[PDB]
């Protein structure tokens, strides 16, 4: 039917039909389009208290809850959506990760190098394309597929 780990499902508000990808977490209207040894993945991370590192180049100890977390990532993925703010911009400003001053960029990696969540969405992303909430013991990311 449809690319690794997509499926259909509907719209609770407007009974519309979507698409949804539950390695990626990412969903959208559209249905979607169309595995290599190496990708290329910026992210965008935020810590929480159960992060296996609660502390980043931004708070020497962070405190917010994993729900906390969770709703600043929902909302930084809103205005990447909506194109009121970049992804490069929020991660520059927001990610925990010290990756923040490469705009999120990582460089390019194979599978046995990451946290098992992360690499299963980064390889399951096509080029250009963007995740939804990803989980990982180091906090919740936004990851995009640059290569
Ligand atoms: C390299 C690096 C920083 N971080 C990347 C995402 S992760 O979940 O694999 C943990 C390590």
Not at 4 to 25: C, D, L, Q
Not at 47 to 68: A, C, D, F, V
Not at 109 to 138: H, W, Y
Request: contains cysteine; glycine residues 8%; aromatic residues 8%.
């Amino acid at each position: 039917k449809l690319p690794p780990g997509w499926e259909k499902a509907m719209s609770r508000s407007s009974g519309r039909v979507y698409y949804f990808n539950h390695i990626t977490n990412a969903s959208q209207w559209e249905r979607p389009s169309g595995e290599p040894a190496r990708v290329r993945c910026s992210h965008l991370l935020v810590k929480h208290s159960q992060s296996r590192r609660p502390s980043s180049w931004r708070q020497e100890k962070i405190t917010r809850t994993k729900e906390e977390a969770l709703e600043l990532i929902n909302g930084y993925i809103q205005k990447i959506k909506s194109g009121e703010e970049d992804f490069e911009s929020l991660a520059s400003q927001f990610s925990d990760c010290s990756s923040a001053k490469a705009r999120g960029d990582l460089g390019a990696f194979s599978r046995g190098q990451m946290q098992k969540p992360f690499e299963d969405a980064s390889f399951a992303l096509r080029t250009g394309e963007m995740s939804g909430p990803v989980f990982t013991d180091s906090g919740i990311h936004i990851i995009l597929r640059t290569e």
